[PDB]
Amino acid sequence: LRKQRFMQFSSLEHEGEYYMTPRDFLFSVMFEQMTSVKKLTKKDIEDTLSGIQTAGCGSTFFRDLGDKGLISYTEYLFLLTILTKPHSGFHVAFKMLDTDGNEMIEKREFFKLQKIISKQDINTTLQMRFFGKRGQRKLHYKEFRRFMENLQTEIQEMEFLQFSKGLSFMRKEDFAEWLLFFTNTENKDIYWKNVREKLSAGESISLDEFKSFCHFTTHLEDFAIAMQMFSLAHRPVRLAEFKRAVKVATGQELSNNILDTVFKIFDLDGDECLSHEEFLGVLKNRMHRGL
Amino acid sequence: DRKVMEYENRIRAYSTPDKIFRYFATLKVFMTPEDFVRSITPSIFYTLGECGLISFSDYIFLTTVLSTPQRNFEIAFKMFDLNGDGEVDMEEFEQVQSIIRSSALTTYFFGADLKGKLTIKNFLEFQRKLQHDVLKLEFERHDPVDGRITERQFGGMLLAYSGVQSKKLTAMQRQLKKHFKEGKGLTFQEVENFFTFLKNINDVDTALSFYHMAGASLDKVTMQQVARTVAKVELSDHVCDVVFALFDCDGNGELSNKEFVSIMKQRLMR
């Protein structure tokens, strides 16, 4: 039923085929529900997606485009899978998209994705980004990896500026309210009791802290190993071992205020221990996209 | 005596592992190296010695050895190593093991004179030898026809690995012999590649979810490409034919997530 969200945030179309803006893509990432679909013929397509090299290929690429972009439903699901993918599966997905074995993804790979779309039953933005105007340009692994990390990082930045409310910093209330976004309302309100009572001022929460935290939340199942080890061993996880587990998982240290605030959040009982069960359950509810 | 045979399955599949431990442990609390096989089934025994499974945590540890993909395994080696020198002696594992529970294999695999100098490769060999011996024992319980188990035997092995009491798939299992009136057999290498593939489904789940949130129609060439990609294993078409004949419940030709992959992933979770 992921077609129905594409039905929701469509705003332009062509020959019965709904499209989106990059902005509608970003709203499908974040916003629940809001527009008017307008029609486009071929001259409109050229005037919109002309000049893709004008956009900078850094970490602001859809903000470099704004509305200048039309996204097929195949590209829509493709970018959603990029947003859901952990770091480890990069070269694996690249070689699965390397059917011809030529260390490359080609335009026939996207046409085979459209073959999948057809079995489930027009020049777009990423076609120009990775293959030029007609597909004559090629696509290697390094551009692919940089594109995936830039996309995820720009999503991190846009959520950061949403919940930080335009500042370069965050408070702990903003971090908790973002972190408890896809939680059920009763546990949310018990957590809000924990916010009102057990959370304090602390200090401002920076950008790289949130970036490392989002990098943590894309590696939850590999983090769950020592969790189930000391779960079936029934060792309630303290903060010092949690530091070691996070460092082994991500490869990067979180700051102590992150760990302190997380420990103030997920300790319902205040018993200096970890209820890892509800932690991991509502966390897997929380890091599921498409919603 | 089926009433004990079926009764052991629920406890060995769902109960806490100390209830699984004391039900199969006789020395007192200790198991033998051969009580462990009865605990895991409804030569490396000579290497295990007698000092084994003191506080049912060598059970947990070798269970983890049986249930860990390779990128989950190297990071387990990371979380063993305290100082991060790339070696784990028996002393660091003793320090971890006291935290776990809060030595005849430590004398075997780490060092003889309390001298543990352990690379990543030996730790990999440990898992490979142990899991390959367990897989060989499971291959030889069903008495292969000159190294070729039958179709219902391999389907029973898959259902024993899945751990879900599906009466539908149980009905399909005894139909497998009736669908394929001829069966050439399933060799040990066909088993050895395919359970290697089944070990890594949560890594395979990356491209499978890529496929899946678009469509749920799994064909054989995609599975063989991801098998040869991730696990670097080869799946013969007889194996995927058996899998399609066993698990395609609606019979639409190609598998969805909740037919096969979601259930196998849920087994990998618990």
Author numbering:
A (entry chain T): 85 to 118, 122 to 208, 230 to 399
B (entry chain S): 108 to 135, 145 to 158, 193 to 252, 276 to 443
Question: Any passages from the paper?
Answer:
Mitochondrial calcium uptake is mediated by the mitochondrial calcium uniporter, a Ca2+-selective channel that is localized to the inner mitochondrial membrane. In humans, the uniporter functions as a holocomplex (referred to as uniplex henceforth) and consists of the pore-forming subunit MCU, an essential membrane-spanning subunit EMRE, and the gate-keeping subunits MICU1 and MICU2. The two-transmembrane (2-TM) MCU component forms a tetrameric channel pore and the single-TM EMRE becomes an integral part of the channel by forming a 1:1 stoichiometric subcomplex with MCU and renders the channel conductive. MICU1 and MICU2 are two paralogous EF-hand containing proteins that are localized to the mitochondrial intermembrane space (IMS) and function as gate-keepers by sensing the cytosolic Ca2+ concentration and, thereby, regulate MCU-EMRE channel activity.
